Amino acid sequence: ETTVTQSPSFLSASVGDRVTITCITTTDIDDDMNWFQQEPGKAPKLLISEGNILRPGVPSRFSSSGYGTDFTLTISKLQPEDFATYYCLQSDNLPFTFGQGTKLEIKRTVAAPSVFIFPPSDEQLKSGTASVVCLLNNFYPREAKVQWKVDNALQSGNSQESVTEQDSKDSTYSLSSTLTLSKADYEKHKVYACEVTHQGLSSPVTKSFNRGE
Amino acid sequence: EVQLVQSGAEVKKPGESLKISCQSFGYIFIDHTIHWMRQMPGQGLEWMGAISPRHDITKYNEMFRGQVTISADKSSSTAYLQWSSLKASDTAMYFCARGGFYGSTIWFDFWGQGTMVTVSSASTKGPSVFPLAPSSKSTSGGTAALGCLVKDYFPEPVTVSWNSGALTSGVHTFPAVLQSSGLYSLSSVVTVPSSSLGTQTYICNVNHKPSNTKVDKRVEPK
Numbered sequence: 001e002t003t004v005t006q007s008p009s010f011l012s013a014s015v016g017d018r019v020t021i022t023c024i025t026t027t028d029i030d031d032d033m034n035w036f037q038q039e040p041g042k043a044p045k046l047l048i049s050e051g052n053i054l055r056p057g058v059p060s061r062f063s064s065s066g067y068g069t070d071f072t073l074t075i076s077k078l079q080p081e082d083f084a085t086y087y088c089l090q091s092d093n094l095p096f097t098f099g100q101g102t103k104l105e106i107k108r109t110v111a112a113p114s115v116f117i118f119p120p121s122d123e124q125l126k127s128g129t130a131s132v133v134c135l136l137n138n139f140y141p142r143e144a145k146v147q148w149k150v151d152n153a154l155q156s157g158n159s160q161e162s163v164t165e166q167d168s169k170d171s172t173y174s175l176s177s178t179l180t181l182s183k184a185d186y187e188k189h190k191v192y193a194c195e196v197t198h199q200g201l202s203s204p205v206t207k208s209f210n211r212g213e
Numbered sequence: 214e215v216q217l218v219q220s221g222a223e224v225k226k227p228g229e230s231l232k233i234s235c236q237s238f239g240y241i242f243i244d245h246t247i248h249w250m251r252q253m254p255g256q257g258l259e260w261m262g263a264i265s266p267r268h269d270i271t272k273y274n275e276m277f278r279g280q281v282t283i284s285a286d287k288s289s290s291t292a293y294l295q296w297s298s299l300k301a302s303d304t305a306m307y308f309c310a311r312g313g314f315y316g317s318t319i320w321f322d323f324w325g326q327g328t329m330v331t332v333s334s335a336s337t338k339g340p341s342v343f344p345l346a347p348s349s350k351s352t353s354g355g356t357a358a359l360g361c362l363v364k365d366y367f368p369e370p371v372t373v374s375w376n377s378g379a380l381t382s383g384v385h386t387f388p389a390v391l392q393s394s395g396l397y398s399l400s401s402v403v404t405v406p407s408s409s410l411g412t413q414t415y416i417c418n419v420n421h422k423p424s425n426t427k428v429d430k431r432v433e434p435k
């Protein structure tokens with residue numbers, strides 16, 4: 001198959017900026033490059049078809065170029081609705097093959113997270129399991145390191161994280177990290193700590209509690 | 214105008230068979246081809262194959278040939294994608310899209326809305342809802358955080374509101390994680406004035422329609 005290499009995979013830009021994304025193919029596909037936009041939970045939308053043809057109703061801030069093996073898409077004057085994932089597609093030969101995608105994120109100022117820790121509830125403890133939750137609220141950029149420590153022992157492979165989509169109003173992210181232990185393990189330890197490293201913090205922030213207290 | 218309408222979400226066990234569908238409206242079905250795309254969770258798009266209903270001709274991506282069958286019914290303008298034996302790794306969103314023939318220059322101009330397929334050994338199970346109670350360890354400035362842990366349910370989705378939809382500001386409902394059980398689990402949190410806390414009642418309303426589980430959980434300080 002023709003391999004399609006799309007770059008960059010991720011790009012931050014401000015509303016109003018202009019950006020250019022590229023796709024390179026392993027075979028000469030003439031002008032058969034196509035561009036799609038996809039928002040989370042939705043089907044892709046065709047923007048531009050073979051021969052750099054903008055589809056009817058697509059804003060003229062989207063344009064493309066390229067012939068052979070090297071292709072680009074430029075979006076000018078980025079609008080908030082433009083911040084989505086873009087995919088290129090070669091339609092020269094079977095099988096149809098897509099680039100791996102470019103996710104465009106809204107750039108904003110650095111914001112440190114507010115950090116909160118939640119001990120397991122007594123109701124959950126009754127059932128034989130303990131979940132400890134650490135919340136990082138309303139931060140930017142998305143990169144954040146969360147470390148769990150139980151009586152100073154670093155927990156590895158013991159936790160799962162989830163991150164929200166960028167907030168439509170303030171362009172921040174929030175993240176939860178859940179540490180899961182047996183009731184038995186939970187009750188043989190005292191200090192539960194969540195340590196957060198983020199570029200908006202001059203040094204790491206630790207939130208902790210002692211079991212019981 | 215042109216609409217491609219796909220069938221509803223599917224939840225299946227490994228080894229089971231499945232046929233999903235895509236029905237076309239607003240154009241002549243036999244004038245185009247219908248193509249099937251896979252999008253695995255968090256991944257990009259893969260072209261699986263296509264059918265010309267006019268000519269009863271199918272084309273498959275080599276990586277999918279022998280795993281799936283694409284077919285069409287001209288009478289109802291419907292295209293189908295089917296597996297005879299599903300695997301966990303078939304868990305993905307599936308899209309149909311319209312195209313042309315050899316020589317055509319426009320591809321996937323209209324898409325269905327697409328169909329989620331989950332394949333798991335797990336069985337239907339309602340969640341337990343636990344409070345994430347506000348305290349000092351969860352009071353930043355004059356801001357407190359509280360929430361609900363919605364643990365151990367299958368399949369997706371669950372919905373969460375706060376105070377029957379009256380509380381929307383500062384709410385974050387997280388995407389669920391799939392546990393090694395798995396059983397999914399998610400948390401929903403809200404930040405509120407610490408002076409709340411206190412005097413305002415906070416209730417998370419949890420709905421898991423697959424198990425018909427509905428829970429209203431009051432979340433109280435300390």
Ligand SMILES: CCCCCCCCCCCCC/C=C/[C@@H](O)[C@@H](N)COP(=O)(O)O
Pocket residue numbers: 030031032050091092093094246263264265268270271272313314315316317318
């Ligand atoms: C009747 C059989 C139908 C079978 C199912 C349909 C599958 C569609 C197959 C076409 C896939 C090859 C992609 C080629 C597309 C060309 O038409 C354009 N790039 C134009 O060709 P150019 O100008 O670049 O040479």
Ligand SMILES: [Ca+2]
Pocket residue numbers: 029030031032050
């Ligand atoms: Ca061409």
Ligand SMILES: [Ca+2]
Pocket residue numbers: 029030031032091092093
């Ligand atoms: Ca070509």
Ligand SMILES: [Mg+2]
Pocket residue numbers: 012013014017
């Ligand atoms: Mg930039």
Ligand SMILES: [Mg+2]
Pocket residue numbers: 018
């Ligand atoms: Mg510029």
Ligand SMILES: [Mg+2]
Pocket residue numbers: 015080106168169171
């Ligand atoms: Mg904005």
Ligand SMILES: [Mg+2]
Pocket residue numbers: 150181185
């Ligand atoms: Mg331990």
